[PDB]
Amino acid sequence: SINIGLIQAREALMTQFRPILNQANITDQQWRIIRLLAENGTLDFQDLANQACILRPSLTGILTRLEKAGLVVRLVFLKLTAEGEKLYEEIGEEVDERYDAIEEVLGREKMLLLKDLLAELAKIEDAL
Amino acid sequence: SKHASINIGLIQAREALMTQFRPILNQANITDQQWRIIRLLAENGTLDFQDLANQACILRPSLTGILTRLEKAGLVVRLVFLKLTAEGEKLYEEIGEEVDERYDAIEEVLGREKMLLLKDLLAELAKIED
């Protein structure tokens, strides 16, 4: 029920977001990594894997491409490059415009509630 | 930036939920997608191929292959409509009982009422497909 509702909600969101990702030729997972490194200051490999919800064997390859593309750099801690910061703001702007279009219909109040409930649900491992 | 990520928020919520369900599904030879099909076939009784694909969010070629496996195991049968077998009904009730036990554990923490609201809000967010 909730499992399925989650996938149905994100899938409907993803179909309209996928054309955007192809214009920068970045994948979903790459975008999550890019955004997380921006919304956080810096993140190590394990923490990045946990928050991006990417398996450790998969994350290494993805990170390598982002560094070859000069978007992410290793120092083990990871952080966006100057260019990575710019890419995040441009794509993020389109997403905010997308967020605004949904909030205009769904309702600002319902939208805020959805954010809180999704955040609490993610946190329920430590709380169990 | 301005507003939080819905993309990331959605996937983080589900991963934490799947973490509580994977040990149950792995003790049986069931995958996430297979379980999704089994529940949908149970809540509707019977579903045709296209309708099943849309609700389980599984691509038609992939759905076909999974269905072939579920029939080899004698859990699903074609009639084009799909339905659980008698044993399929048994597996759903058996696995479902273990799954329900985890929902109760989560709801004790998240809140029984809030859990219900989240389903509604996700459906509304989902219906604004456009």
Side-chain angles (χ1 to χ4, degrees), chain A residues 18-67:
Chain A
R18 282 188 182 99
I20 288 81
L21 291 183
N22 289 359
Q23 184 165 2
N25 203 335
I26 67 163
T27 69
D28 181 18
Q29 294 179 321
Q30 286 173 349
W31 170 240
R32 284 137 59 180
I33 297 168
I34 291 172
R35 184 168 196 148
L36 285 170
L37 286 181
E39 287 175 353
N40 295 267
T42 184
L43 288 177
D44 60 69
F45 184 83
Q46 298 184 344
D47 285 335
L48 181 59
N50 299 337
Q51 299 192 29
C53 300
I54 305 176
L55 296 175
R56 293 185 183 180
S58 296
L59 178 58
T60 49
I62 302 177
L63 285 178
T64 298
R65 286 185 283 158
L66 291 178
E67 299 171 26

mmCIF file of all heavy atoms in Angstrom, chain A residues 18-67:
data_model
loop_
_atom_site.group_PDB
_atom_site.id
_atom_site.type_symbol
_atom_site.label_atom_id
_atom_site.label_comp_id
_atom_site.label_asym_id
_atom_site.label_seq_id
_atom_site.Cartn_x
_atom_site.Cartn_y
_atom_site.Cartn_z
ATOM 1 N N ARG A 18 12.708 13.080 -16.266
ATOM 2 C CA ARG A 18 13.668 12.351 -17.103
ATOM 3 C C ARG A 18 14.182 13.124 -18.333
ATOM 4 O O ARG A 18 15.376 13.062 -18.629
ATOM 5 C CB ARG A 18 13.064 11.017 -17.561
ATOM 6 C CG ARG A 18 13.090 9.934 -16.502
ATOM 7 C CD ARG A 18 12.673 8.585 -17.056
ATOM 8 N NE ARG A 18 12.671 7.574 -16.003
ATOM 9 C CZ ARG A 18 11.582 7.171 -15.354
ATOM 10 N NH1 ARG A 18 10.399 7.686 -15.657
ATOM 11 N NH2 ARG A 18 11.679 6.250 -14.404
ATOM 12 N N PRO A 19 13.294 13.835 -19.065
ATOM 13 C CA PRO A 19 13.803 14.623 -20.197
ATOM 14 C C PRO A 19 14.825 15.674 -19.778
ATOM 15 O O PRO A 19 15.735 15.991 -20.542
ATOM 16 C CB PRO A 19 12.543 15.288 -20.756
ATOM 17 C CG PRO A 19 11.446 14.378 -20.376
ATOM 18 C CD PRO A 19 11.819 13.852 -19.026
ATOM 19 N N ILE A 20 14.672 16.199 -18.568
ATOM 20 C CA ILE A 20 15.593 17.193 -18.035
ATOM 21 C C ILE A 20 16.968 16.569 -17.811
ATOM 22 O O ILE A 20 17.989 17.159 -18.169
ATOM 23 C CB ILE A 20 15.075 17.812 -16.718
ATOM 24 C CG1 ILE A 20 13.893 18.746 -16.989
ATOM 25 C CG2 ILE A 20 16.165 18.620 -16.044
ATOM 26 C CD1 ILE A 20 12.561 18.056 -17.151
ATOM 27 N N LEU A 21 16.993 15.369 -17.237
ATOM 28 C CA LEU A 21 18.255 14.691 -16.952
ATOM 29 C C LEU A 21 19.058 14.371 -18.208
ATOM 30 O O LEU A 21 20.290 14.373 -18.172
ATOM 31 C CB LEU A 21 18.003 13.398 -16.175
ATOM 32 C CG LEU A 21 17.509 13.545 -14.739
ATOM 33 C CD1 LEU A 21 17.368 12.182 -14.086
ATOM 34 C CD2 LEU A 21 18.480 14.410 -13.959
ATOM 35 N N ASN A 22 18.372 14.097 -19.313
ATOM 36 C CA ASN A 22 19.059 13.783 -20.561
ATOM 37 C C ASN A 22 19.700 15.007 -21.217
ATOM 38 O O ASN A 22 20.657 14.873 -21.979
ATOM 39 C CB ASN A 22 18.101 13.118 -21.546
ATOM 40 C CG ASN A 22 17.736 11.702 -21.143
ATOM 41 O OD1 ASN A 22 18.206 11.187 -20.128
ATOM 42 N ND2 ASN A 22 16.900 11.062 -21.948
ATOM 43 N N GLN A 23 19.181 16.195 -20.921
ATOM 44 C CA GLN A 23 19.749 17.429 -21.460
ATOM 45 C C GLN A 23 21.124 17.731 -20.870
ATOM 46 O O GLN A 23 21.976 18.328 -21.532
ATOM 47 C CB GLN A 23 18.808 18.613 -21.214
ATOM 48 C CG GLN A 23 19.295 19.919 -21.831
ATOM 49 C CD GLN A 23 18.217 20.982 -21.890
ATOM 50 O OE1 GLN A 23 17.091 20.767 -21.440
ATOM 51 N NE2 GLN A 23 18.563 22.146 -22.430
ATOM 52 N N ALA A 24 21.346 17.298 -19.633
ATOM 53 C CA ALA A 24 22.656 17.427 -19.003
ATOM 54 C C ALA A 24 23.382 16.093 -19.076
ATOM 55 O O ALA A 24 24.540 15.968 -18.674
ATOM 56 C CB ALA A 24 22.517 17.883 -17.562
ATOM 57 N N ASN A 25 22.673 15.106 -19.614
ATOM 58 C CA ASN A 25 23.152 13.735 -19.765
ATOM 59 C C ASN A 25 23.647 13.132 -18.443
ATOM 60 O O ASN A 25 24.619 12.375 -18.410
ATOM 61 C CB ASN A 25 24.258 13.681 -20.825
ATOM 62 C CG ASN A 25 24.419 12.295 -21.437
ATOM 63 O OD1 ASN A 25 24.084 11.282 -20.825
ATOM 64 N ND2 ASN A 25 24.927 12.252 -22.662
ATOM 65 N N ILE A 26 22.976 13.489 -17.353
ATOM 66 C CA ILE A 26 23.267 12.927 -16.038
ATOM 67 C C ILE A 26 22.144 11.960 -15.683
ATOM 68 O O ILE A 26 20.995 12.168 -16.077
ATOM 69 C CB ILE A 26 23.431 14.001 -14.938
ATOM 70 C CG1 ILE A 26 22.109 14.715 -14.653
ATOM 71 C CG2 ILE A 26 24.523 14.992 -15.314
ATOM 72 C CD1 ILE A 26 22.108 15.462 -13.344
ATOM 73 N N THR A 27 22.469 10.889 -14.968
ATOM 74 C CA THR A 27 21.438 9.946 -14.555
ATOM 75 C C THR A 27 20.809 10.384 -13.236
ATOM 76 O O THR A 27 21.285 11.319 -12.594
ATOM 77 C CB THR A 27 22.000 8.521 -14.398
ATOM 78 O OG1 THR A 27 22.886 8.470 -13.272
ATOM 79 C CG2 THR A 27 22.750 8.105 -15.651
ATOM 80 N N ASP A 28 19.724 9.715 -12.858
ATOM 81 C CA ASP A 28 19.023 10.000 -11.611
ATOM 82 C C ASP A 28 19.971 9.922 -10.430
ATOM 83 O O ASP A 28 20.075 10.855 -9.635
ATOM 84 C CB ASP A 28 17.872 9.018 -11.405
ATOM 85 C CG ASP A 28 17.093 9.283 -10.133
ATOM 86 O OD1 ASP A 28 17.195 10.400 -9.585
ATOM 87 O OD2 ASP A 28 16.377 8.365 -9.682
ATOM 88 N N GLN A 29 20.665 8.795 -10.334
ATOM 89 C CA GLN A 29 21.571 8.545 -9.226
ATOM 90 C C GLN A 29 22.690 9.578 -9.185
ATOM 91 O O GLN A 29 23.092 10.015 -8.106
ATOM 92 C CB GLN A 29 22.136 7.130 -9.324
ATOM 93 C CG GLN A 29 21.071 6.061 -9.139
ATOM 94 C CD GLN A 29 21.619 4.659 -9.270
ATOM 95 O OE1 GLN A 29 22.466 4.392 -10.122
ATOM 96 N NE2 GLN A 29 21.134 3.750 -8.429
ATOM 97 N N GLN A 30 23.188 9.972 -10.353
ATOM 98 C CA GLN A 30 24.211 11.008 -10.408
ATOM 99 C C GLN A 30 23.653 12.313 -9.864
ATOM 100 O O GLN A 30 24.329 13.017 -9.119
ATOM 101 C CB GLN A 30 24.730 11.211 -11.830
ATOM 102 C CG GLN A 30 25.643 10.107 -12.318
ATOM 103 C CD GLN A 30 26.002 10.257 -13.779
ATOM 104 O OE1 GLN A 30 25.412 11.064 -14.496
ATOM 105 N NE2 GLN A 30 26.985 9.485 -14.227
ATOM 106 N N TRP A 31 22.410 12.616 -10.220
ATOM 107 C CA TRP A 31 21.758 13.828 -9.738
ATOM 108 C C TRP A 31 21.559 13.825 -8.224
ATOM 109 O O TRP A 31 21.757 14.846 -7.568
ATOM 110 C CB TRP A 31 20.414 14.024 -10.434
ATOM 111 C CG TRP A 31 19.587 15.113 -9.826
ATOM 112 C CD1 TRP A 31 18.348 14.984 -9.272
ATOM 113 C CD2 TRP A 31 19.954 16.491 -9.677
ATOM 114 N NE1 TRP A 31 17.910 16.199 -8.805
ATOM 115 C CE2 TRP A 31 18.878 17.140 -9.038
ATOM 116 C CE3 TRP A 31 21.082 17.239 -10.028
ATOM 117 C CZ2 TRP A 31 18.899 18.501 -8.742
ATOM 118 C CZ3 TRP A 31 21.099 18.590 -9.732
ATOM 119 C CH2 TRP A 31 20.014 19.208 -9.097
ATOM 120 N N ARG A 32 21.168 12.683 -7.671
ATOM 121 C CA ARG A 32 21.028 12.556 -6.226
ATOM 122 C C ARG A 32 22.355 12.805 -5.520
ATOM 123 O O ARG A 32 22.407 13.489 -4.502
ATOM 124 C CB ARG A 32 20.467 11.184 -5.858
ATOM 125 C CG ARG A 32 18.979 11.074 -6.127
ATOM 126 C CD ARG A 32 18.603 9.759 -6.771
ATOM 127 N NE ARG A 32 18.978 8.609 -5.961
ATOM 128 C CZ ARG A 32 18.755 7.353 -6.325
ATOM 129 N NH1 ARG A 32 18.157 7.101 -7.480
ATOM 130 N NH2 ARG A 32 19.123 6.352 -5.537
ATOM 131 N N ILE A 33 23.428 12.258 -6.077
ATOM 132 C CA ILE A 33 24.755 12.454 -5.514
ATOM 133 C C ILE A 33 25.148 13.921 -5.601
ATOM 134 O O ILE A 33 25.655 14.495 -4.637
ATOM 135 C CB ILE A 33 25.798 11.592 -6.234
ATOM 136 C CG1 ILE A 33 25.474 10.114 -6.032
ATOM 137 C CG2 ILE A 33 27.195 11.905 -5.728
ATOM 138 C CD1 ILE A 33 26.250 9.206 -6.928
ATOM 139 N N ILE A 34 24.904 14.525 -6.759
ATOM 140 C CA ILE A 34 25.249 15.924 -6.969
ATOM 141 C C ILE A 34 24.480 16.822 -6.003
ATOM 142 O O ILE A 34 25.056 17.711 -5.376
ATOM 143 C CB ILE A 34 24.959 16.363 -8.419
ATOM 144 C CG1 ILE A 34 25.925 15.674 -9.384
ATOM 145 C CG2 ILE A 34 25.073 17.874 -8.556
ATOM 146 C CD1 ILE A 34 25.587 15.888 -10.838
ATOM 147 N N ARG A 35 23.183 16.570 -5.862
ATOM 148 C CA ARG A 35 22.356 17.373 -4.972
ATOM 149 C C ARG A 35 22.724 17.189 -3.499
ATOM 150 O O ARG A 35 22.778 18.161 -2.744
ATOM 151 C CB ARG A 35 20.877 17.052 -5.183
ATOM 152 C CG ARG A 35 19.961 17.932 -4.353
ATOM 153 C CD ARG A 35 18.516 17.811 -4.778
ATOM 154 N NE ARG A 35 17.727 18.918 -4.248
ATOM 155 C CZ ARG A 35 16.671 19.442 -4.859
ATOM 156 N NH1 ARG A 35 16.268 18.953 -6.024
ATOM 157 N NH2 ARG A 35 16.014 20.450 -4.303
ATOM 158 N N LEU A 36 22.982 15.949 -3.095
ATOM 159 C CA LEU A 36 23.339 15.661 -1.708
ATOM 160 C C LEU A 36 24.652 16.326 -1.316
ATOM 161 O O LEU A 36 24.784 16.847 -0.209
ATOM 162 C CB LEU A 36 23.434 14.154 -1.474
ATOM 163 C CG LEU A 36 22.108 13.400 -1.384
ATOM 164 C CD1 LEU A 36 22.362 11.911 -1.402
ATOM 165 C CD2 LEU A 36 21.342 13.801 -0.132
ATOM 166 N N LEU A 37 25.620 16.309 -2.227
ATOM 167 C CA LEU A 37 26.910 16.933 -1.970
ATOM 168 C C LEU A 37 26.778 18.447 -1.899
ATOM 169 O O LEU A 37 27.630 19.123 -1.329
ATOM 170 C CB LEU A 37 27.921 16.544 -3.047
ATOM 171 C CG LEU A 37 28.465 15.120 -2.960
ATOM 172 C CD1 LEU A 37 29.481 14.865 -4.062
ATOM 173 C CD2 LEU A 37 29.079 14.886 -1.588
ATOM 174 N N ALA A 38 25.716 18.977 -2.495
ATOM 175 C CA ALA A 38 25.473 20.412 -2.473
ATOM 176 C C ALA A 38 24.661 20.825 -1.249
ATOM 177 O O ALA A 38 24.966 21.830 -0.608
ATOM 178 C CB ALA A 38 24.763 20.844 -3.743
ATOM 179 N N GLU A 39 23.636 20.040 -0.923
ATOM 180 C CA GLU A 39 22.755 20.351 0.203
ATOM 181 C C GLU A 39 23.456 20.064 1.523
ATOM 182 O O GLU A 39 23.103 20.617 2.563
ATOM 183 C CB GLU A 39 21.445 19.568 0.099
ATOM 184 C CG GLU A 39 20.520 20.085 -0.994
ATOM 185 C CD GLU A 39 19.285 19.225 -1.180
ATOM 186 O OE1 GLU A 39 19.201 18.151 -0.546
ATOM 187 O OE2 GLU A 39 18.396 19.628 -1.959
ATOM 188 N N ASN A 40 24.438 19.175 1.470
ATOM 189 C CA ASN A 40 25.318 18.921 2.597
ATOM 190 C C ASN A 40 26.632 19.593 2.246
ATOM 191 O O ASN A 40 26.823 19.997 1.102
ATOM 192 C CB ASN A 40 25.514 17.426 2.842
ATOM 193 C CG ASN A 40 24.235 16.728 3.254
ATOM 194 O OD1 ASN A 40 23.951 16.582 4.441
ATOM 195 N ND2 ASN A 40 23.459 16.289 2.271
ATOM 196 N N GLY A 41 27.537 19.733 3.204
ATOM 197 C CA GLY A 41 28.801 20.370 2.895
ATOM 198 C C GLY A 41 29.678 19.399 2.133
ATOM 199 O O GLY A 41 29.987 19.595 0.956
ATOM 200 N N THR A 42 30.064 18.332 2.817
ATOM 201 C CA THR A 42 30.841 17.258 2.222
ATOM 202 C C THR A 42 30.377 15.940 2.824
ATOM 203 O O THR A 42 29.862 15.912 3.942
ATOM 204 C CB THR A 42 32.351 17.452 2.444
ATOM 205 O OG1 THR A 42 33.074 16.425 1.757
ATOM 206 C CG2 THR A 42 32.689 17.402 3.926
ATOM 207 N N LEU A 43 30.543 14.851 2.085
ATOM 208 C CA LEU A 43 30.117 13.548 2.572
ATOM 209 C C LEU A 43 31.137 12.481 2.215
ATOM 210 O O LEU A 43 31.716 12.502 1.132
ATOM 211 C CB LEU A 43 28.751 13.173 1.995
ATOM 212 C CG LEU A 43 27.528 13.932 2.512
ATOM 213 C CD1 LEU A 43 26.273 13.479 1.781
ATOM 214 C CD2 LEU A 43 27.373 13.745 4.012
ATOM 215 N N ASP A 44 31.359 11.553 3.139
ATOM 216 C CA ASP A 44 32.242 10.428 2.877
ATOM 217 C C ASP A 44 31.496 9.384 2.064
ATOM 218 O O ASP A 44 30.290 9.500 1.850
ATOM 219 C CB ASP A 44 32.774 9.819 4.175
ATOM 220 C CG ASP A 44 31.672 9.308 5.076
ATOM 221 O OD1 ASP A 44 31.023 8.303 4.719
ATOM 222 O OD2 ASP A 44 31.460 9.907 6.150
ATOM 223 N N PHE A 45 32.229 8.379 1.597
ATOM 224 C CA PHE A 45 31.680 7.346 0.726
ATOM 225 C C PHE A 45 30.465 6.632 1.317
ATOM 226 O O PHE A 45 29.430 6.516 0.661
ATOM 227 C CB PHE A 45 32.768 6.322 0.401
ATOM 228 C CG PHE A 45 32.334 5.261 -0.562
ATOM 229 C CD1 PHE A 45 32.362 5.494 -1.925
ATOM 230 C CD2 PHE A 45 31.915 4.024 -0.105
ATOM 231 C CE1 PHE A 45 31.971 4.516 -2.814
ATOM 232 C CE2 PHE A 45 31.522 3.044 -0.989
ATOM 233 C CZ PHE A 45 31.549 3.291 -2.346
ATOM 234 N N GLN A 46 30.594 6.156 2.552
ATOM 235 C CA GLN A 46 29.525 5.394 3.192
ATOM 236 C C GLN A 46 28.264 6.227 3.393
ATOM 237 O O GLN A 46 27.164 5.787 3.054
ATOM 238 C CB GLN A 46 29.999 4.834 4.537
ATOM 239 C CG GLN A 46 31.172 3.868 4.426
ATOM 240 C CD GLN A 46 31.554 3.247 5.759
ATOM 241 O OE1 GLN A 46 31.163 3.733 6.821
ATOM 242 N NE2 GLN A 46 32.326 2.166 5.706
ATOM 243 N N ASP A 47 28.428 7.428 3.940
ATOM 244 C CA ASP A 47 27.295 8.311 4.195
ATOM 245 C C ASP A 47 26.604 8.711 2.897
ATOM 246 O O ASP A 47 25.380 8.838 2.848
ATOM 247 C CB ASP A 47 27.737 9.553 4.972
ATOM 248 C CG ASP A 47 27.995 9.256 6.436
ATOM 249 O OD1 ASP A 47 27.415 8.279 6.954
ATOM 250 O OD2 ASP A 47 28.778 9.995 7.068
ATOM 251 N N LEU A 48 27.392 8.902 1.844
ATOM 252 C CA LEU A 48 26.836 9.252 0.545
ATOM 253 C C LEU A 48 26.003 8.088 0.015
ATOM 254 O O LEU A 48 24.932 8.289 -0.554
ATOM 255 C CB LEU A 48 27.946 9.613 -0.442
ATOM 256 C CG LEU A 48 27.492 10.018 -1.843
ATOM 257 C CD1 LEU A 48 26.571 11.227 -1.770
ATOM 258 C CD2 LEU A 48 28.686 10.307 -2.735
ATOM 259 N N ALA A 49 26.500 6.873 0.220
ATOM 260 C CA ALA A 49 25.801 5.669 -0.217
ATOM 261 C C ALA A 49 24.460 5.533 0.494
ATOM 262 O O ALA A 49 23.447 5.216 -0.129
ATOM 263 C CB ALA A 49 26.655 4.440 0.029
ATOM 264 N N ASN A 50 24.467 5.774 1.802
ATOM 265 C CA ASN A 50 23.264 5.649 2.619
ATOM 266 C C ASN A 50 22.182 6.655 2.252
ATOM 267 O O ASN A 50 21.000 6.316 2.210
ATOM 268 C CB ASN A 50 23.609 5.803 4.101
ATOM 269 C CG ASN A 50 24.573 4.744 4.586
ATOM 270 O OD1 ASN A 50 24.684 3.672 3.993
ATOM 271 N ND2 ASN A 50 25.277 5.039 5.672
ATOM 272 N N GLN A 51 22.589 7.897 2.001
ATOM 273 C CA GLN A 51 21.633 8.965 1.725
ATOM 274 C C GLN A 51 21.144 8.944 0.280
ATOM 275 O O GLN A 51 19.991 9.274 0.006
ATOM 276 C CB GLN A 51 22.242 10.326 2.058
ATOM 277 C CG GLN A 51 22.638 10.481 3.518
ATOM 278 C CD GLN A 51 22.953 11.916 3.884
ATOM 279 O OE1 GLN A 51 22.406 12.852 3.297
ATOM 280 N NE2 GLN A 51 23.844 12.099 4.852
ATOM 281 N N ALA A 52 22.018 8.558 -0.644
ATOM 282 C CA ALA A 52 21.638 8.460 -2.051
ATOM 283 C C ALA A 52 20.906 7.154 -2.313
ATOM 284 O O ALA A 52 20.331 6.960 -3.384
ATOM 285 C CB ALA A 52 22.858 8.573 -2.949
ATOM 286 N N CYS A 53 20.936 6.269 -1.319
ATOM 287 C CA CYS A 53 20.355 4.934 -1.420
ATOM 288 C C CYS A 53 20.930 4.193 -2.622
ATOM 289 O O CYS A 53 20.200 3.692 -3.477
ATOM 290 C CB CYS A 53 18.831 5.020 -1.509
ATOM 291 S SG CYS A 53 18.074 5.812 -0.066
ATOM 292 N N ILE A 54 22.257 4.139 -2.670
ATOM 293 C CA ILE A 54 22.983 3.428 -3.710
ATOM 294 C C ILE A 54 23.933 2.413 -3.089
ATOM 295 O O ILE A 54 24.643 2.724 -2.134
ATOM 296 C CB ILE A 54 23.794 4.388 -4.596
ATOM 297 C CG1 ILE A 54 22.893 5.475 -5.178
ATOM 298 C CG2 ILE A 54 24.502 3.628 -5.707
ATOM 299 C CD1 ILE A 54 23.651 6.510 -5.982
ATOM 300 N N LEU A 55 23.922 1.195 -3.617
ATOM 301 C CA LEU A 55 24.828 0.146 -3.163
ATOM 302 C C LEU A 55 26.288 0.558 -3.351
ATOM 303 O O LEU A 55 26.633 1.205 -4.340
ATOM 304 C CB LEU A 55 24.556 -1.157 -3.914
ATOM 305 C CG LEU A 55 23.192 -1.815 -3.709
ATOM 306 C CD1 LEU A 55 23.048 -3.015 -4.629
ATOM 307 C CD2 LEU A 55 23.011 -2.233 -2.264
ATOM 308 N N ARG A 56 27.132 0.197 -2.389
ATOM 309 C CA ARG A 56 28.549 0.560 -2.421
ATOM 310 C C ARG A 56 29.276 0.145 -3.714
ATOM 311 O O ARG A 56 30.077 0.922 -4.234
ATOM 312 C CB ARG A 56 29.285 -0.031 -1.211
ATOM 313 C CG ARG A 56 28.873 0.552 0.133
ATOM 314 C CD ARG A 56 29.734 -0.013 1.257
ATOM 315 N NE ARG A 56 29.317 0.464 2.573
ATOM 316 C CZ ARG A 56 29.905 0.115 3.714
ATOM 317 N NH1 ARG A 56 30.941 -0.711 3.701
ATOM 318 N NH2 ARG A 56 29.461 0.598 4.867
ATOM 319 N N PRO A 57 29.022 -1.074 -4.232
ATOM 320 C CA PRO A 57 29.688 -1.404 -5.501
ATOM 321 C C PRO A 57 29.277 -0.495 -6.664
ATOM 322 O O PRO A 57 30.101 -0.206 -7.533
ATOM 323 C CB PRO A 57 29.248 -2.849 -5.763
ATOM 324 C CG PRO A 57 28.883 -3.385 -4.429
ATOM 325 C CD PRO A 57 28.292 -2.235 -3.688
ATOM 326 N N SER A 58 28.017 -0.074 -6.690
ATOM 327 C CA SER A 58 27.534 0.818 -7.741
ATOM 328 C C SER A 58 28.041 2.253 -7.586
ATOM 329 O O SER A 58 28.331 2.924 -8.576
ATOM 330 C CB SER A 58 26.007 0.819 -7.773
ATOM 331 O OG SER A 58 25.507 -0.457 -8.121
ATOM 332 N N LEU A 59 28.155 2.715 -6.344
ATOM 333 C CA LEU A 59 28.529 4.099 -6.074
ATOM 334 C C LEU A 59 29.925 4.460 -6.579
ATOM 335 O O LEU A 59 30.133 5.555 -7.101
ATOM 336 C CB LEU A 59 28.436 4.382 -4.572
ATOM 337 C CG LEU A 59 28.839 5.790 -4.127
ATOM 338 C CD1 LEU A 59 27.985 6.830 -4.829
ATOM 339 C CD2 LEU A 59 28.738 5.940 -2.619
ATOM 340 N N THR A 60 30.871 3.538 -6.431
ATOM 341 C CA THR A 60 32.246 3.768 -6.872
ATOM 342 C C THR A 60 32.327 4.132 -8.351
ATOM 343 O O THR A 60 32.976 5.108 -8.724
ATOM 344 C CB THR A 60 33.129 2.536 -6.628
ATOM 345 O OG1 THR A 60 32.470 1.372 -7.141
ATOM 346 C CG2 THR A 60 33.389 2.349 -5.146
ATOM 347 N N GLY A 61 31.664 3.339 -9.186
ATOM 348 C CA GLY A 61 31.652 3.580 -10.616
ATOM 349 C C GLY A 61 31.004 4.901 -10.968
ATOM 350 O O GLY A 61 31.508 5.645 -11.809
ATOM 351 N N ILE A 62 29.891 5.201 -10.308
ATOM 352 C CA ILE A 62 29.178 6.452 -10.537
ATOM 353 C C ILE A 62 30.038 7.651 -10.143
ATOM 354 O O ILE A 62 30.089 8.652 -10.859
ATOM 355 C CB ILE A 62 27.854 6.494 -9.756
ATOM 356 C CG1 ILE A 62 26.967 5.312 -10.147
ATOM 357 C CG2 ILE A 62 27.133 7.800 -10.014
ATOM 358 C CD1 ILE A 62 25.679 5.232 -9.366
ATOM 359 N N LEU A 63 30.715 7.539 -9.006
ATOM 360 C CA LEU A 63 31.592 8.604 -8.533
ATOM 361 C C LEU A 63 32.745 8.843 -9.503
ATOM 362 O O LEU A 63 33.124 9.986 -9.757
ATOM 363 C CB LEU A 63 32.144 8.277 -7.148
ATOM 364 C CG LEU A 63 31.176 8.443 -5.979
ATOM 365 C CD1 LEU A 63 31.860 8.029 -4.688
ATOM 366 C CD2 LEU A 63 30.676 9.876 -5.893
ATOM 367 N N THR A 64 33.298 7.758 -10.033
ATOM 368 C CA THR A 64 34.407 7.856 -10.971
ATOM 369 C C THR A 64 34.004 8.645 -12.213
ATOM 370 O O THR A 64 34.775 9.466 -12.706
ATOM 371 C CB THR A 64 34.916 6.466 -11.389
ATOM 372 O OG1 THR A 64 35.413 5.772 -10.238
ATOM 373 C CG2 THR A 64 36.030 6.592 -12.412
ATOM 374 N N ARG A 65 32.788 8.420 -12.702
ATOM 375 C CA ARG A 65 32.310 9.150 -13.873
ATOM 376 C C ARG A 65 32.132 10.631 -13.567
ATOM 377 O O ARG A 65 32.433 11.484 -14.401
ATOM 378 C CB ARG A 65 30.998 8.564 -14.398
ATOM 379 C CG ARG A 65 31.156 7.246 -15.138
ATOM 380 C CD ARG A 65 29.837 6.797 -15.737
ATOM 381 N NE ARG A 65 28.936 6.235 -14.737
ATOM 382 C CZ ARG A 65 27.618 6.159 -14.881
ATOM 383 N NH1 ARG A 65 27.044 6.623 -15.982
ATOM 384 N NH2 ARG A 65 26.872 5.626 -13.921
ATOM 385 N N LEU A 66 31.646 10.934 -12.368
ATOM 386 C CA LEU A 66 31.442 12.319 -11.963
ATOM 387 C C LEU A 66 32.767 13.065 -11.831
ATOM 388 O O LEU A 66 32.824 14.280 -12.013
ATOM 389 C CB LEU A 66 30.682 12.376 -10.641
ATOM 390 C CG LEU A 66 29.223 11.928 -10.681
ATOM 391 C CD1 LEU A 66 28.623 11.999 -9.292
ATOM 392 C CD2 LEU A 66 28.421 12.774 -11.657
ATOM 393 N N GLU A 67 33.830 12.334 -11.516
ATOM 394 C CA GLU A 67 35.154 12.934 -11.398
ATOM 395 C C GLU A 67 35.811 13.082 -12.758
ATOM 396 O O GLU A 67 36.502 14.067 -13.016
ATOM 397 C CB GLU A 67 36.029 12.108 -10.466
ATOM 398 C CG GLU A 67 35.458 12.025 -9.073
ATOM 399 C CD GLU A 67 36.188 11.044 -8.204
ATOM 400 O OE1 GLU A 67 37.383 10.791 -8.463
ATOM 401 O OE2 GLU A 67 35.560 10.519 -7.264
#
